[PDB]
Amino acid sequence: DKLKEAETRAEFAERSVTKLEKSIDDLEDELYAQKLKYKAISEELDHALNDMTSI
Amino acid sequence: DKLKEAETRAEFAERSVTKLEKSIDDLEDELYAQKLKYKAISEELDHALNDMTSI
Amino acid sequence: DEDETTALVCDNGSGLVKAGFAGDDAPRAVFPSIVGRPRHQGVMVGMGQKDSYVGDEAQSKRGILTLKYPIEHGIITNWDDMEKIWHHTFYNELRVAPEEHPTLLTEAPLNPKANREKMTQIMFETFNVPAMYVAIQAVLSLYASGRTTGIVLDSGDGVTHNVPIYEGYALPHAIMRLDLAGRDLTDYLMKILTERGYSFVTTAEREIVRDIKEKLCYVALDFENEMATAASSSSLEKSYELPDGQVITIGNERFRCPETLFQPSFIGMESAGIHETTYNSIMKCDIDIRKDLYANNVMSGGTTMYPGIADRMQKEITALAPSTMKIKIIAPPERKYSVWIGGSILASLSTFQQMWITKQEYDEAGPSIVHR
Amino acid sequence: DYLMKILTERGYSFVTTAEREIVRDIKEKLCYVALDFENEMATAASSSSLEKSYELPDGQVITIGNERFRCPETLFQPSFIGMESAGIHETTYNSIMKCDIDIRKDLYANNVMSGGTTMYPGIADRMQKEITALAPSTMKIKIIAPPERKYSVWIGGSILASLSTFQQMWITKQEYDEAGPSIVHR
Amino acid sequence: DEDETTALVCDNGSGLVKAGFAGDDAPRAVFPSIVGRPRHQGVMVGMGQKDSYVGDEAQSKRGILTLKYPIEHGIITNWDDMEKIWHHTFYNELRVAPEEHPTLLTEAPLNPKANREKMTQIMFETFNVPAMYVAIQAVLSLYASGRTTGIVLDSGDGVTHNVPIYEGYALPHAIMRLDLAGRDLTDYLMKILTERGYSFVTTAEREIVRDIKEKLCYVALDFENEMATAASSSSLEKSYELPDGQVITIGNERFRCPETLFQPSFIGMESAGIHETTYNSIMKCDIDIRKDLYANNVMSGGTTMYPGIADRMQKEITALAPSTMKIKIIAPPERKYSVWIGGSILASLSTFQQMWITKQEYDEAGPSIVHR
């Protein structure tokens, strides 16, 4: 009986780890996408703040 | 005997899930920090492109 | 393959539908057994006017609809709204056309003869399925645990049952029904948790008390000196983080909720509890079959999943049963789908083909044919 | 009108109507909503190069250092003007704990700002921190303040009314002459 | 006389305290349940610096103090501020010394065990009363209407309740609480009256909307064809003269305000209303006791005073109850003090002496003693 319980929970803990590992890779990837989509708008920015201080 | 094996492995799977869950929460939090640090620079931007088109 | 692939298994519950293909190991589709009807005229962006909503879209949009439950206590109470849940199951959830798939359905323990004939009338005459079959739920649960004689304590969302089965025939006069289940149990936790000094105020607070019940609730053995333990205050406590930060703590109540299943008195119920009822079912059966039932207490249903349910039941009936007896409480891990899995096995089986009620049988014998 | 008084109170006079009108152009150009309005007054005192002088219709260079932000601190503290009502951020919040529970994560991540008076720079940062610190930490806060916000309302109408699908919601004289004013009232 | 004269009865509410001597017919003291704390340093002419203000001096001086309500929804939420309201009641309002008076207090329907023990701890240990007793509010209301079995719809300033009582024991599992009461009701009138094209701008405009609600509001029976009546515009209208001349007219809204108690949807409440809730309490009770509860719907509380409340409720539950049943809605005239009067009767009674918890019981048994 201790067994059915230990095994059933091992299976649930493994299903939850694969679920959370799958959600960590999607957030970490959505990420370098966000972190990069920015260097571009922050750099378009030092530029688009410098020309109106000049005009 | 099947038991010592199912339990020991369950413990290792649980240790790995808590490790990966801890790394998903740090990336997802480093995240709303990045995603938000931007709404601010992209909005500071529609603004800092609108006043020089006006000046 | 014609129908090896093709058999569908639909288990209709009071809270959830479980559905999928005979052959699979678990239900392809699981969703609430609701049918929402919009309280006001209007639309979602990009959609048309919808007359009705079913399953999760009814739950998600519950604030603008009047929600209705077709199955009260395991029995189909509204046939207009049930044909709606079936329609949704075939066409949207499993995305199959029903007119080329044999369909194994389930019914409840003492399901009125007339209902088994009515869902047959609707299966064959409005969905035009090739063939169908209605199995009794406890009977599929037992069978999914390999055996043919045993007694199933079956407990889901609106009903609890005890169905003693002998060489496959569920024993009508020994079946017991207790109308207190997981639904009742979430609402009691609710109060002992607001009573712990809390507030489940918005609907995002309400719903998650149920996810607290599922994740953190326990059935302690020696529930007596577990309250006593609570008081010395060990590291028995357990804090859950809400949709936001609001870390709620649940130490003790954690097990006061499933102690409701042994003590219905916790909720103003005067009925007997799960273990006594297991037993009473058993001293209502033939004498010669009582050693069999005792060594084969199979558990199935979402509400029998509370850890330590089996140990408490083990000791609950040992101590009521004559000592000459062998007690044995089987509680498998997949038990929230036992019923379904028993249907998947049975309907994919090599020998079941000759029990399918075909449109030939029906068009020729009337609903009586499948009724048995 | 509050800036007016804290600026006459700075030792000034908006005497003719050409003095009155331009206090409003001072408010628009030079006013700020500081985050940590607390240690901004403190900053004012050490007297940094926080000050800001505006040249009037004529030469009369008026200086506004500090009051510059004491004016939008009125939106968080109505007590600055003898108002007993709650302020902008608390009110954002109270609206939110008056709504259904399940919809409160949505509202919190979508605080859209519109209107001429929400244009004071740093309004969004102050509001950001104002409601984070009132909201349960499990929550995501998000204060959207677009640049064109003094015309959000109008632009939303321009979009909607030029839209391809809106044609079927226009109340026509046919609807009206036949249904009475009730028709458009919904 | 020792205590025949000497028993005090203090009914603690969400909006008002009602207090006085057991024996009297009505409360000697009635005042708001607030505790004001001055926002600035300074004094009134001739007085000293005051740290705190309670009751009417807190209301009258509200512009310089931060007002706080100790009892949220009938439950004591702040014990520092409650001991302040009690102090005020004994020493200033009733001007008695508490250490020679037995004190009957009241609590709410499902008042947490721990609170009944805490106010006992404060009554005996900081006020040093000889003896005390905590009665449940609906239970005193019932009893003040002579009977012992009935169901009380109790509705005051912050809570509404239904407390089914059988031979004196309030039935825990059948009690319903609806957090919408007279406070909610004054604020809704406020809006339908500003919405009538008005302005309650200064604080002398705010306060009197509540006096409009009390004097001119109605609960119409057939609220349907009362709106219809409003339109034909009969001499149904009613103008009230403000602190000054400013004659304000209220025709219609007059009853749109108590229709909120049957339709919570008027105020963005999704909960059921008063009459349905009376009923649901009743189909949650034992079967054999349901004819009793139906013929004994006792009403108490300030918000149940709206004329025609009883007729609407009469017809509201007749038409939900099985026709074999006798409906009977008792609404006495003194109902804004039922609770208190029931306590006055009980505590001045000849047989109650043997239930008083004495300092002997307490110093010997701990707060547990009175908790029951």
UniProtKB/Swiss-Prot annotation, chains A, B:
Family in the record: Belongs to the tropomyosin family.
Residues of the full protein shown: 230 to 284 of 284
Domain-level remarks: The molecule is in a coiled coil structure that is formed by 2 polypeptide chains. The sequence exhibits a prominent seven-residues periodicity.
Domain of life: Eukaryota
Subunit description: Homodimer. Heterodimer of an alpha (TPM1, TPM3 or TPM4) and a beta (TPM2) chain. Interacts with HRG (via the HRR domain); the interaction contributes to the antiangiogenic properties of the histidine/proline-rich region (HRR) of HRG. Interacts (via N-terminus) with LMOD2 (via N-terminus) and TMOD1 (via N-terminus).
Transmembrane parts of this sequence: none
In-chain residues carrying the UniProt-annotated modification Phosphotyrosine: 32
Phosphoserine found at: 23, 42, 54
Protein name: Tropomyosin alpha-1 chain
Subcellular location: Cytoplasm, Cytoskeleton
Post-translational modification: Phosphorylated at Ser-54 by DAPK1 in response to oxidative stress and this phosphorylation enhances stress fiber formation in endothelial cells.
General function of this protein: Binds to actin filaments in muscle and non-muscle cells. Plays a central role, in association with the troponin complex, in the calcium dependent regulation of vertebrate striated muscle contraction. Smooth muscle contraction is regulated by interaction with caldesmon. In non-muscle cells is implicated in stabilizing cytoskeleton actin filaments.
From Swiss-Prot, chains C, E:
Alphabetized GO MF terms: actin monomer binding; ATP binding; calcium ion binding; calcium-dependent protein binding; cytoskeletal motor activator activity; hydrolase activity; identical protein binding; magnesium ion binding
Domain of life: Eukaryota
Protein name: Actin, alpha skeletal muscle
Complexes and interactors: Polymerization of globular actin (G-actin) leads to a structural filament (F-actin) in the form of a two-stranded helix. Each actin can bind to 4 others. Interacts with alpha-actinin. Identified in a complex composed of ACTA1, COBL, GSN and TMSB4X. Interacts with TTID. Interacts (via its C-terminus) with USP25.
Listed SMART domains: ACTIN
Origin species: Oryctolagus cuniculus (Rabbit)
Gene Ontology biological process terms, A to Z: actin filament bundle assembly; actin filament polymerization; mesenchyme migration; positive regulation of gene expression; skeletal muscle fiber development; skeletal muscle thin filament assembly
Modified sites of kind N-acetylaspartate: 1
Classification via InterPro entries: Actin (IPR004000), Actin/actin-like_CS (IPR020902), Actin_CS (IPR004001), ATPase_NBD (IPR043129)
N6-malonyllysine: modified positions: 61
Methionine (R)-sulfoxide PTM positions: 44, 47
Residue numbers bearing the N6-methyllysine modification: 84
Subcellular location: Cytoplasm, Cytoskeleton
Keywords from the named record: Acetylation, ADP-ribosylation, ATP-binding, Cytoplasm, Cytoskeleton, Hydrolase, Methylation, Muscle protein, Nucleotide-binding, Oxidation
GO cellular component: actin filament; actin filament bundle; cell body; cytoplasm; filamentous actin; filopodium; lamellipodium; skeletal muscle myofibril
Function: Actins are highly conserved proteins that are involved in various types of cell motility and are ubiquitously expressed in all eukaryotic cells.
Record PTM text: Oxidation of Met-44 and Met-47 by MICALs (MICAL1, MICAL2 or MICAL3) to form methionine sulfoxide promotes actin filament depolymerization. MICAL1 and MICAL2 produce the (R)-S-oxide form. The (R)-S-oxide form is reverted by MSRB1 and MSRB2, which promotes actin repolymerization. Can be mono-ADP-ribosylated on Arg-177 by SpvB of Salmonella spp. This modification blocks subsequent polymerization and leads to cell death.
Extra facts: In vertebrates 3 main groups of actin isoforms, alpha, beta and gamma have been identified. The alpha actins are found in muscle tissues and are a major constituent of the contractile apparatus. The beta and gamma actins coexist in most cell types as components of the cytoskeleton and as mediators of internal cell motility.
Sites bearing ADP-ribosylarginine, chain numbering: 177
Taxonomic lineage from the root: Eukaryota, Metazoa, Chordata, Craniata, Vertebrata
Annotated region (Interaction with alpha-actinin), positions in chain: 110-123, 358-370
PTM sites of type Tele-methylhistidine: 73
This enzyme's EC code(s): 3.6.4.-
Family: Belongs to the actin family.
